[PDB]
């Protein structure tokens, strides 16, 4: 077999049988052989074992003659930003944010923070590590500590006109991940009043592993919004490359609707741009992008595909319904910080609440939410769905699984690239009844 920690998009496994300091050192050696010239940026998340894994990575890299730029405890987006900003040969973020307590991982990028994925270097690294029985060399390169966040913070603040911001009251919930450290560095330069929930970084995660999608975790942010009369709330995953929004009523806003909203926010600053979106939920994004004079570009889901498509299109912005938002000048990469700054500015300038910014769009294009299925035979289940609907002759697109457009309703059905599951999304043209009957019909077919 092969080392199971090497997945399609990153490295992820239980410590210490699937990921440990010796593997991390070997990964550093192998990474050095996979990159063009230059130093390598390293950072890590709040998990207790993360520093030691980073240090082993550094030892392997420096044994291979790579200078290391240690950016410290950070978010994943800071590894992306510093790798590109400093013109480094690549970067590694030590994190496996959503996984259980005994798990860690690594996200790897090359020049300009371009992803290293299974077919673009990661499995080459895996195979080198797998066969590497050499004794560890000693370091022949240096490590520098570079914890200055000025250029990163200035980049974040460039997405808003400070003089137009109003003193909104914002709930922020880092979930004991790392997001609060950036919020607090930004706060002196913003007029907002922050209500800080689960704010201190704690790798023991006393309030649960950060995952705002779990209803119990979602409810902590919703309660804080309602109880404090906040204008909106923001929660993050642990490495804070994903952001999650709650309007003033406490209602969680499905990520689908933020894609169109953020696209309009960016198109106001960069008119006529191309906007990359995924195939799971589309109609609202296409309409809002075109209404704002942008050009929507359909792309397979998954951060590496989004980024490569954005690059080829000079796209100003990309958005996935899975809470990932990508910005051209941010190394074409995803940020959990840029989106809430943009939303705070929209609310400030428009005088409209976040609820009003999305309400009509949610009524116009209601969606199922992503529904996941572990079935005995994914291929037979997909075929059962398609055969059932054949007599209606949907328009079919195979960008990412199967997308079927029936006119007043559509669905996307695909296999996950990170887990052995099928993922379903359905939306309709303003018809909540059709949404529910079709969702339940597909569900029954998949479970058959
Ligand atoms: O654990 P994370 O690396 O923070 O999240 C990743 O794995 C979980 C997915 O929901 C995310 O979209 C993906 O980015
Ligand atoms: O498991 P997957 O569905 O293949 O990928 C997920 O993890 C990475 C994100 O880019 C995707 O949008 C998210 O859906
Ligand atoms: Mg994350």
**Which DSSP string corresponds to 403-442?**
EEE-SSEEEEEEE-SSSS-EEEEEEESS-HHHHHHHHHHH
CATH topology of domain 366-448: TATA-Binding Protein (3.30.310)
Q: Say how far apart CA 42 and CA 28 lie, in whole Å.
A: 11
322 CB under 6 A from ligand 1? yes
Q: Which residues line ligand 2 (CB under 6 A)?
A: 301-303, 320, 322, 324, 416-419, 423
How many of the other CB atoms lie within 10 Å of CB of 418? 11
Q: Say how far apart CA 389 and CA 347 lie, in whole Å.
A: 42
Strands (E), 210-292: 232-236, 243-246, 274-277
In eight-state DSSP terms, residue 252 is B
**Resolution limit in angstroms?**
1.5
Q: Which two structure tokens, joined as six digits, stand for 105? A: 């991982």
Find all residues with CB under 8 Å of 300, minimum gap 6, and list them: 278, 279, 399, 400
Q: CATH class for domain 247-365?
A: alpha beta
Q: Say how far apart CA 305 and CA 307 lie, in whole Å.
A: 5
Torsion angles phi and psi, residue 356, rounded to 5 = -65, -30
In eight-state DSSP terms, residue 10 is S
Q: Which two structure tokens, joined as six digits, stand for 119? A: 């077919």
Residue 366 backbone zone (phi > 0: left; psi -120 to 50: alpha; other: beta): beta
Is 210 in contact with 175 (CB distance < 8 Å)? yes
Helix runs in 34-149, H state only: 50-63, 76-85, 122-131
Task: Name the strand (E) or helix (H) holding 302.
Answer: none
Chain breaks in the chain (C to N over 2.5 A) after: none
How many of the other CB atoms lie within 10 Å of CB of 123? 18
97 CB under 6 A from ligand 1? yes
Q: Say how far apart CA 364 and CA 435 lie, in whole Å.
A: 12
Is 168 in contact with 347 (CB distance < 8 Å)? yes
CATH number at 1-147: 3.40.120.10
User: Measured from the CA of 213, which atom of ligand 1 is nearest?
Assistant: 10
Q: Which two structure tokens, joined as six digits, stand for 268? A: 């106001």
Task: Take atom 11 of ligand 2 and give the residue whose Cα is closest.
Answer: 302
Q: Which two structure tokens, joined as six digits, stand for 356? A: 């009003």
The reply to whether omega before 234 is within 30° of 0 (cis) is no
Span(s) in the chain for CATH 3.40.120.10: 1-147, 169-246, 247-365
Q: Which of 371, 414, 418 to mutate to test the pocket of ligand 2 (most atoms within 8 A of CB)?
A: 418
226 CB under 6 A from ligand 1? no
**Cα distances (angstroms) measured from residue 429 to each of 97, 291, 410:** 36, 17, 9
How many of the other CB atoms lie within 10 Å of CB of 349? 15
Span(s) in the chain for CATH 3.30.310.50: 366-448
**Cα distances (angstroms) measured from residue 302 to each of 165, 184, 254, 336:** 33, 30, 18, 16
Protein residues placing their CB within 5 Å of the ion ligand 3: 97, 237, 239, 241
Q: Which of 50, 64, 97, 368 is catalytic?
A: 97
Q: Say how far apart CA 174 and CA 200 lie, in whole Å.
A: 8
Q: What does 187-215 look like in DSSP terms, one character per residue?
A: GGGS-PEEEEES-S--TT-TT-SS-TTSH
| Cα(171) to centroid(ligand 2), Å | 27
In eight-state DSSP terms, residue 390 is G
Q: Say how far apart CA 206 and CA 198 lie, in whole Å.
A: 9
Q: What would be the CATH architecture of the domain defined by 169-246?
A: 3-Layer(aba) Sandwich (3.40)
Task: Take atom 8 of ligand 1 and give the residue whose Cα is closest.
Answer: 98
User: Measured from the CA of 9, which atom of ligand 2 is nearest?
Assistant: 8
How was this entry determined?
Answer: X-ray
If we measure between CA atoms, which residue out of 235, 271, 277 comes closest to residue 256?
277
Q: Which of 416, 423, 424, 425 to mutate to test the pocket of ligand 2 (most atoms within 8 A of CB)?
A: 416
Q: Say how far apart CA 255 and CA 275 lie, in whole Å.
A: 16
Q: Say how far apart CA 53 and CA 20 lie, in whole Å.
A: 7
Task: Take atom 4 of ligand 1 and give the residue whose Cα is closest.
Answer: 97
**Cα distances (angstroms) measured from residue 388 to each of 233, 360, 442, 445:** 42, 32, 9, 8
Find all residues with CB under 8 Å of 218, minimum gap 6, and list them: 212, 235, 244, 246, 252
Burial of 395 (0-12, 13-18, 19+ CB in 10 A): exposed
Examine the residue annotation and report whether 58 is marked as an active-site residue of this protein.
Answer: no
Q: Say how far apart CA 175 and CA 58 lie, in whole Å.
A: 28
Q: Which two structure tokens, joined as six digits, stand for 249? A: 């009523």
Is 238 in contact with 177 (CB distance < 8 Å)? yes
Q: How far apart are the first and last CA of the chain?
A: 32
Task: Take atom 11 of ligand 1 and give the residue whose Cα is closest.
Answer: 322
| Cα(147) to centroid(ligand 2), Å | 30
Query: Please, which residues bridge with residue 73 across strands?
Result: 44
| Cα(303) to centroid(ligand 2), Å | 7
| Number of residues that make up the chain | 448
417 CB under 6 A from ligand 1? no
Q: Which residue has the tokens 């080459």?
A: 124
Q: Which two structure tokens, joined as six digits, stand for 242? A: 């994903």
Query: Please, which residues bridge with residue 425 across strands?
Result: 412
Find all residues with CB under 8 Å of 67, minimum gap 6, and list them: 39, 40, 141, 142, 143, 144
Q: Say how far apart CA 234 and CA 344 lie, in whole Å.
A: 11
In eight-state DSSP terms, residue 38 is S
């Amino acid at each position: 077999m092969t080392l199971p920690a090497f997945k399609a998009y990153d490295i992820r496994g239980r410590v210490p049988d699937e990921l440990n300091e010796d593997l991390a050192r070997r990964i550093g050696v192998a990474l050095a052989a996979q990159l063009d010239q230059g130093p390598v940026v390293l950072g890590h998340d709040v998990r207790l074992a993360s520093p030691a894994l980073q240090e082993a990575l550094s030892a392997g890299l420096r044994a291979s003659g790579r200078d290391v730029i240690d950016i410290g405890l950070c978010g994943t987006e800071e590894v992306y930003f510093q790798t590109d900003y400093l013109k480094a040969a690549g970067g590694v973020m030590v994190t496996a944010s959503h996984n259980p307590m005994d798990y860690n991982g690594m996200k790897l990028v090359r020049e300009q923070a371009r992803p290293i994925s299974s077919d673009t270097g990661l499995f080459a690294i895996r195979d080198t590590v797998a066969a590497d029985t050499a004794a560890p060399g000693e370091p022949t390169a240096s490590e520098q500590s570079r914890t200055d966040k000025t250029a990163y913070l200035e980049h974040l603040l460039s997405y808003v006109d400070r003089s137009t911001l109003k003193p909104l009251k914002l709930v922020v919930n880092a979930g004991n991940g790392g997001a609060g450290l950036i919020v607090d560095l930004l706060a002196p330069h913003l007029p907002f009043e922050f209500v800080r929930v689960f704010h201190e970084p704690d790798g023991n995660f006393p309030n649960g592993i950060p995952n705002p999608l779990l209803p119990e975790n979602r409810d902590a942010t919703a309660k804080a919004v309602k109880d404090n009369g906040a204008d909106f709330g923001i929660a993050w995953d642990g490495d804070f490359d994903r952001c999650f929004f709650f309007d003033h009523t406490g209602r969680f806003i499905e990520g689908y609707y933020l894609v169109g909203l953020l696209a309009q926010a960016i198109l106001a600053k960069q008119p006529g741009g191309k906007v990359v979106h995924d195939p799971r939920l589309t109609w609202n994004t296409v309409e809002q992008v075109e209404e704002a004079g942008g050009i929507p570009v359909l792309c397979k889901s998954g951060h590496a595909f989004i980024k490569e498509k954005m690059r080829s299109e000079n796209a100003v912005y990309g958005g996935e319904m899975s809470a990932h938002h990508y910005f051209r000048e941010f190394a074409y990469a995803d940020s959990g910080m840029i989106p809430w700054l943009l939303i705070a500015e929209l609310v400030s300038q428009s005088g409209r609440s976040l609820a009003d910014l999305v309400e009509a769009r949610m009524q116009k294009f209601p969606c199922s939410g992503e529904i996941n299925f572990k079935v005995a035979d994914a291929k037979a289940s997909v075929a059962r769905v398609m055969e059932h609907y054949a007599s209606l002759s949907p328009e079919l697109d195979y960008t990412d699984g199967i997308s079927a457009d029936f006119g007043q309703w559509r669905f996307n059905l695909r296999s996950s690239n990170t887990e052995p599951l099928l993922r379903l999304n359905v939306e309709t043209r303003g018809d909540a009844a059709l949404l529910e009957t079709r969702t339940q019909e597909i569900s029954n077919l998949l479970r058959g």
